[PDB]
Structure formats: C-alpha cells, structure tokens
Amino acid sequence: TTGLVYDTLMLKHQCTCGSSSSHPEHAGRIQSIWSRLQETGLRGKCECIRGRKATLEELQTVHSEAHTLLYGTNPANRQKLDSKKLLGSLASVFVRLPCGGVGVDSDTIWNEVHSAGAARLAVGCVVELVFKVATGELKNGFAVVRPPGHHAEESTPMGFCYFNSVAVAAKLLQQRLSVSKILIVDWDVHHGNGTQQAFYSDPSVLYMSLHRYDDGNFFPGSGAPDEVGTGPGVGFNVNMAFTGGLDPPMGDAEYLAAFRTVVMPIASEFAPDVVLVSSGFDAVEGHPTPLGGYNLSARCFGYLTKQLMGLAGGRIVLALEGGHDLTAICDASEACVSALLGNELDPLPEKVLQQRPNANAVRSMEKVMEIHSKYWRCLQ
Numbered sequence: 540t541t542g543l544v545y546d547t548l549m550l551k552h553q554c555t556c557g558s559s560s561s562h563p564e565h566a567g568r569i570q571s572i573w574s575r576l577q578e579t580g581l582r583g584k585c586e587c588i589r590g591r592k593a594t595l596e597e598l599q600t601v602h603s604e605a606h607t608l609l610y611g612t613n614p615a616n617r618q619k620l621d622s623k624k625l626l627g628s629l630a631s632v633f634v635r636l637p638c639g640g641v642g643v644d645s646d647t648i649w650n651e652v653h654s655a656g657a658a659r660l661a662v663g664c665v666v667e668l669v670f671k672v673a674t675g676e677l678k679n680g681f682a683v684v685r686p687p688g689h690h691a692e693e694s695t696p697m698g699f700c701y702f703n704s705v706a707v708a709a710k711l712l713q714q715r716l717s718v719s720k721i722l723i724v725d726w727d728v729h730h731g732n733g734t735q736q737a738f739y740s741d742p743s744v745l746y747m748s749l750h751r752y753d754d755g756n757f758f759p760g761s762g763a764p765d766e767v768g769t770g771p772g773v774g775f776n777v778n779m780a781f782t783g784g785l786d787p788p789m790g791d792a793e794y795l796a797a798f799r800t801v802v803m804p805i806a807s808e809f810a811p812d813v814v815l816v817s818s819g820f821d822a823v824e825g826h827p828t829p830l831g832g833y834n835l836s837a838r839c840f841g842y843l844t845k846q847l848m849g850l851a852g853g854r855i856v857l858a859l860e861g862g863h864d865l866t867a868i869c870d871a872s873e874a875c876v877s878a879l880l881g882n883e884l885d886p887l888p889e890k891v892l893q894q895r896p897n898a899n900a901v902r903s904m905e906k907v908m909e910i911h912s913k914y915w916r917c918l919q
C-alpha cells in the first residue's frame with residue numbers, strides 16, 4: 540500500500556508583509572496539490588500518515604548546531620537552549636525585504652512565529668514516511684511538503700530552503716537502520732547543492748541530479764558534470780548537467796534519453812536498498828526563466844517514477860521540492876501518485892516517443908558518460 544503525508548501547519552510559513560503574492564514558494568502550492576489528489580480519488584486510495592516535527596538532534600545529522608538553533612526554535616527557546624553560546628547577534632542576520640517583510644537574505648523569508656515549526660514539520664513528515672517504507676510498513680510514498688530543502692547547506696539557508704529534509708531522511712536511515720546503500724535522485728530543475736555537499740565523501744549514498752546547468756549561469760550555479768565526489772565517494776556523485784540554454788529548450792525526449800543511457804544503468808549497477816527522490820516539478824512547461832525554461836510534460840514524471848520503482852524492491856519515496864505553476868505541479872503530482880499505486884499511466888505523444896534528443900542534450904549526455912566511464916562498469 541502507498542503512503543501520503545501532508546499537514547496544514549506547513550501552510551503558516553508566510554511572509555510578515557502579509558501578501559503571498561510577492562513570493563513564489565507559497566502556501567497555495569501544497570494546498571492545491573492536496574485537493575487535486577483528493578478530488579481525483581487518489582488520496583482515498585493511500586495511507587495518510589500523521590507527521591511530526593523533527594528533533595534538533597535529527598536536524599544536526601546534516602546541519603550545524605548553530606543553524607538548527609537559529610532556524611528551528613522560537614525566540615524564547617532559541618536563547619534558553621543555546622547554553623554553548625554558539626550564536627552571535629540576531630541583528631547580524633535579519634534584513635528587511637522590498638515587500639516590507641523580514642528576510643534572511645535578499646529573498647528568503649522568515650516568520651519568527653511560524654517558520655521554525657513549519658520547517659521542522661517538513662523534515663519530520665518526510666522522515667516518518669521514509670522510515671515506514673524502509674521497515675516494510677509501506678511499499679512506497681509521496682511527501683507533499685513545504686518549505687523545500689535541497690538547497691539548504693550545512694549552516695547556510697538559500698533558495699527558500701532551511702533544512703534539507705531528504706538528506707536528513709537519508710542520514711537517519713544509515714544511523715538508525717544501517718541501510719547500506721541509498722540512492723538519491725533529484726529531478727528538480729535546479730541543482731540540489733545541499734544534498735551534494737551532505738554526501739560528497741560518502742559512497743553508501745549515490746546522489747544523481749538532473750538539472751539545468753548552462754556553464755553555471757543558472758541558479759544555484761552548482762552541479763557541474765566533473766564534480767564526481769571526493770575520497771571514497773569518488774564516482775558516487777553524478778551530475779546530469781544540461782547545457783547550451785534554450786536552443787531548443789529541453790523536453791520529454793531529452794530526459795527519457797538521459798534516464799535510459801545515464802541514470803538507470805548507474806542506478807542498476809549501484810543497486811540500492813532504498814530510493815529517495817527530491818521531487819521538484821519546475822522542469823515542466825509553464826516555468827519561465829529563472830524558475831525553469833524547460834518544456835517537459837507532467838505526464839513524463841509518471842514514467843520516470845515507474846522506472847525508479849523497478850529499483851530497490853520498489854522501496855521508493857518522493858518528496859516535493861520546487862514547482863510553481865499550479866496546473867503543472869498538480870498534473871505531475873497526480874501522475875506520480877498514480878504510478879506509485881500501480882495504475883496504468885496516461886500515454887505520451889507518439890511524436891515524443893519517436894523524437895531523437897536535441898544536439899545540446901546529446902552533447903551534455905556525452906560529457907557525463909566520458910567523465911563517469913572511469914567509475915562504472917556499465918559505461919565502458
């Protein structure tokens with residue numbers, strides 16, 4: 540049976556200015572996905588679990604103690620709990636934003652009453668779901684959560700992220716069940732800079748990212764194809780970095796190709812016990828630059844899910860990251876759950892199945908395959 544998780548206290552992460560219309564990562568996002576799964580009957584066919592807030596201890600598997608105190612507590616307990624006096628002056632952190640609200644940098648918001656609780660709830664939800672899949676309690680699942688995580692570095696918050704939920708889920712799986720091999724696939728359009736960092740030296744976790752890279756001119760700017768890992772982790776960080784811009788913009792045929800020639804042969808060789816997916820939906824059409832630029836169809840994500848379900852005995856869990864256009868994220872989310880339930884998938888266009896991938900995608904896929912041919916039997 541297939542699990543879902545969702546909680547309305549994540550709807551309170553909102554800017555103090557009062558109008559969410561100044562901010563792309565908005566409460567409406569998870570809210571609309573949720574009703575789409577309800578009215579299409581997909582939700583009623585899933586186990587809906589009670590999520591919780593993550594502990595500071597759990598958060599500290601990935602993030603510094605300082606960072607966890609800062610972004611994980613309300614003002615009163617922040618001071619009470621910081622007995623080590625790790626934090627400096629809050630005046631050094633908070634900025635005012637153009638919209639009139641309080642920020643942490645030039646565009647990441649902070650609600651001193653609600654953001655800490657919502658962020659820990661995002662991590663806690665994903666953890667619970669993941670642990671249910673790893674222990675045989677469920678087959679698979681989808682985490683409908685916010686704020687997002689994959690940009691959240693050890694002690695630095697960016698791109699509307701504060702705590703890398705997926706990275707935390709992974710560490711706990713290692714620490715508390717000793718899961719020997721985990722795959723993290725990240726298909727959000729942006730590189731998952733945080734996740735890469737959290738496992739760069741760790742060969743028990745394979746991080747595979749499909750993103751728009753463009754000579755590092757696209758947010759966050761990280762994730763180049765030769766960033767292959769360090770130490771024992773060499774080979775176990777794979778950046779399927781697309782380049783050459785929108786000439787043309789990348790689509791279903793380019794991604795399906797990437798999956799066939801790059802992602803799945805490495806995934807299969809690696810042979811993991813649990814697949815985790817940073818499931819962002821900004822690669823779907825309707826996401827103008829810098830938000831996206833690509834022209835994938837929400838349907839395609841159903842098919843990508845189904846390829847990954849073939850790995851790890853079916854032990855797969857997906858967790859929301861980016862995605863903005865409501866129709867786009869709602870269509871894509873429906874596709875993913877639908878695949879996860881074992882349903883027959885809404886078909887792809889005949890033109891798309893027959894299309895050869897554009898030149899820039901082939902140039903991009905070649906670079907990767909030459910770089911990683913050193914580390915994997917399947918590409919040599």
Ligand SMILES: O=C(NO)[C@]1(F)[C@H](c2ccccc2)[C@H]1c1ccc(-c2ncc(F)cn2)cc1
Nearest residue numbers: 563564698727729758819821829860861862863
């Ligand atoms: O998709 C994302 N991450 O995977 C984002 F970071 C954030 C987003 C998340 C969810 C909904 C809507 C948006 C979008 C994003 C993309 C680019 C920037 C950015 N920031 C600074 C800059 F100079 C250029 N681009 C910021 C946020």
Ligand code: NA
Nearest residue numbers: 725748749750
């Ligand atoms: Na990515």
Ligand SMILES: [Zn+2]
Nearest residue numbers: 554556638640
């Ligand atoms: Zn604001």
Ligand SMILES: [Zn+2]
Nearest residue numbers: 727729821861
């Ligand atoms: Zn994104």
